[PDB]
Homo-oligomer: A and B are copies of this chain.
Amino acid sequence: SRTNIDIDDELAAEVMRRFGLTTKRAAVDLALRRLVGSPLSREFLLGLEGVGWEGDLDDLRS
């Protein structure tokens, strides 16, 4: 994961301007999370069936 790559400095800063980020680790992280998310394993996702949701969707909508 320690990875040696060319990252456009301007671009990383440009993202730092736009999103009020104070890093590059912040910009890259965001960039990646937005586009493909974070690792969600198959078992996790399947395990959500029956996890429960006690709120009322009618209250939130109508």
Query: How big is the A interface, by class?
Result: 20 to 34
Chain B residues whose C-beta falls within 8 Å of the C-beta of A2 in the assembled complex: 4-7
* Contact, CB under 8 Å: B35 / A8: no
Q: Which residues of chain A have a CB within 8 Å of any CB of chain B?
A: 1-12, 14-15, 18-19, 23-25, 27-36, 38-39, 59, 61-62
Contact (A3, B6) CB under 8 Å given A28-B28, A32-B11: yes
Quick one: copies of this chain in the complex?
4
A32 contact from B3, B7, B23, B25, Cβ within 8 A: B7
B24→A35 contact, CB < 8 A:
no
**14 pairs of residues in contact across A and B, judged by CB atoms under 8 Å:** A1-B6, A2-B6, A3-B5, A7-B32, A8-B29, A8-B32, A11-B29, A11-B32, A12-B32, A18-B36, A27-B32, A31-B32, A31-B35, A34-B35
